[PDB]
Design a binder for this molecule. Structure first.
Ligand SMILES: *[C@@H]1O[C@H](CO)[C@@H](O)[C@H](O)[C@H]1NC(C)=O
Ligand SMILES: *[C@@H]1O[C@H](CO)[C@@H](O)[C@H](O)[C@H]1NC(C)=O
Lengths: 49, 19
């Protein structure tokens, strides 16, 4: 759900779109995430590992 | 490069006014 589960009813939303939301919230455009999605995913997986 | 994009058409606020 993202952040809506803590401010009211839960709303379903794809996780890449939630990541685009969180990237646009800090000033970075959503295109860098919508294009380089595989790189961000691999970096996140490597960090989690 | 975008994964999950669909084909559609967008509107232009200049084409109908000019044509
Ligand atoms: C959604 O995920 C499924 C499972 O991987 C995949 O088969 C499908 O093509 C994806 N659709 C979109 C919107 O990318
Ligand atoms: C989108 O358009 C391209 C070029 O016409 C085509 O190859 C592709 O199959 C289309 N995909 C969809 C979502 O219909």
């Amino acid at each position: 759900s993202g952040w809506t589960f803590g401010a009211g009813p839960a709303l379903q939303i794809p996780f890449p779109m939630q990541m685009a939301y969180r990237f646009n919230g800090i000033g970075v455009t959503q295109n860098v995430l919508y294009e380089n999605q595989k790189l961000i995913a691999n970096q996140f997986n490597s960090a989690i590992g | 490069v975008v994964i999950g994009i669909v084909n559609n058409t967008v509107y232009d606020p200049l084409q109908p006014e000019l044509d």
